[PDB]
């Protein structure tokens, strides 16, 4: 398509479906999620966003990313830190798992941020725009499945407090993405990186499912 935001959505429909079809996510959507399983997903989200925001902060002034730099509206690290303290306790930093599949995702994020920063937008799009769209549906399913007490914590990740209107912000974020200047060769790679992001999530889901079935 013409607009990058339009091209991204179009090219990732197939892999997005695969994500939804992943056994781990199938169970999740069927409301068949356990606390042990939800803890693992929160853990991986932490590693993922720490690496991602670390790289974004590194290329924020670069012309290949600056346009989609919205730190206050999107940053998720503090949110996950709060959440993990609830899920794994005060010593969460010493006990949260950091699995091989999580590491493979983290390693690709640092690789892009450091050797192909022009592709970072692919990951910011996939994480942030994704979380902002299908984030509510998964949170709804989660709480309704988890049966959390009433301690007022554990799900801050699913709320973007600095964004008043999700639809208005996504319009803006798409605009900014469509303003990025890139050669057709780069655009094709940004498109490919996005699909790869999905694949990294799928192999993560496959790993988490394996760890939980024993
Ligand atoms: C398997 C559970 C998932 C469900 C049920 C889910 C659901 C949704 C829904 C309902 C939307 C709403 C906006 C729309 O469709 O127009 C959406 C958009 C999106 N999702 Fe997912 N999603 C899931 C997993 C993921 C994963 C693993 C990623 C990637 C890390 C992701 C990335 C995206 C992106 C980037 C968009 C926005 C695309 C665009 O606007 O161009 N989703 N998702």
UniProtKB/Swiss-Prot annotation:
Membrane topology listed for this record: Single-pass type IV membrane protein
Record localization: Endoplasmic reticulum membrane
PTM comment text: A soluble form arises by proteolytic removal of the membrane anchor.
Enzyme class: oxidoreductase
Keywords: Apoptosis, Endoplasmic reticulum, Heme, Host-virus interaction, Iron, Membrane, Metal-binding, Oxidoreductase, Phosphoprotein, Transmembrane, Transmembrane helix
E.C. number(s) listed in UniProt: 1.14.14.18
Example GO molecular function: enzyme binding
Single GO BP term: regulation of angiogenesis
Superkingdom to which the source organism belongs: Eukaryota
Triggers of expression: Heme oxygenase 1 activity is highly inducible by its substrate heme and by various non-heme substances such as heavy metals, bromobenzene, endotoxin, oxidizing agents and UVA.
Catalytic activity: heme b + 3 reduced [NADPH--hemoprotein reductase] + 3 O2 = biliverdin IXalpha + CO + Fe(2+) + 3 oxidized [NADPH--hemoprotein reductase] + 3 H2O + H(+)
Residue intervals on the Cytoplasmic side: 1-214
Tissue: Expressed at higher levels in renal cancer tissue than in normal tissue (at protein level).
Site feature: Important for catalytic activity: 131
Record: residues binding heme b: 9, 16, 125, 174
Cellular component aspect of the GO annotation: cytosol; endoplasmic reticulum; endoplasmic reticulum membrane; extracellular space; membrane; mitochondrial outer membrane; nucleoplasm; nucleus
Family the UniProt entry places it in: Belongs to the heme oxygenase family.
Record remark on domains: The transmembrane domain is necessary for its oligomerization.
Oligomeric and partner information: (Microbial infection) Interacts with SARS-CoV-2 ORF3A protein; the interaction promotes ORF3A-induced autophagy but is unlikely to be involved in ORF3A-mediated induction of reticulophagy. Homodimer and higher order homooligomer. Oligomerization is crucial for its stability and function in the endoplasmic reticulum. Interacts with FLVCR2; this interaction is potentiated in the presence of heme.
Disease field: Heme oxygenase 1 deficiency: A disease characterized by impaired stress hematopoiesis, resulting in marked erythrocyte fragmentation and intravascular hemolysis, coagulation abnormalities, endothelial damage, and iron deposition in renal and hepatic tissues. Clinical features include persistent hemolytic anemia, asplenia, nephritis, generalized erythematous rash, growth retardation and hepatomegaly.
The protein's name in its UniProt record: Heme oxygenase 1
Provenance organism: Homo sapiens
The gene coding this protein: HMOX1
Entire-sequence positions represented here: 10 to 223 of 288
């Amino acid at each position: 398509p013409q607009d990058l935001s339009e091209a991204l959505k179009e090219a990732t429909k197939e892999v997005h479906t695969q994500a939804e079809n992943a056994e781990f996510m199938r169970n999740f959507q069927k409301g068949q999620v356990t606390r042990d399983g939800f803890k693992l997903v929160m853990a991986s989200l932490y590693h993922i966003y720490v690496a991602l925001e670390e790289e974004i902060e590194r290329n924020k002034e670069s012309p290949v990313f600056a346009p989609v730099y919205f730190p206050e509206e999107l940053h998720r690290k503090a949110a996950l830190e709060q959440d993990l303290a609830f899920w794994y306790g005060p010593r969460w930093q010493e006990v949260i798992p950091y699995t091989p599949a999580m590491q493979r995702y983290v390693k690709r994020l640092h690789e892009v941020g450091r050797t192909e920063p022009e592709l970072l937008v692919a990951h910011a799009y996939t994480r942030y725009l994704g979380a902002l769209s299908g984030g509510q549906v998964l949170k709804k399913i989660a709480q309704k499945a988890l049966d959390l007490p009433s301690s007022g914590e554990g799900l801050a990740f699913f709320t973007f407090p600095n964004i008043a209107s999700a639809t208005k912000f996504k319009q803006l974020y798409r605009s900014r993405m469509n303003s990025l200047e890139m050669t057709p060769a780069v655009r094709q790679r940004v498109i490919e990186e996005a699909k790869t992001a999905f694949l990294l999530n799928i192999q993560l889901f496959e790993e988490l499912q394996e760890l939980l079935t024993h």
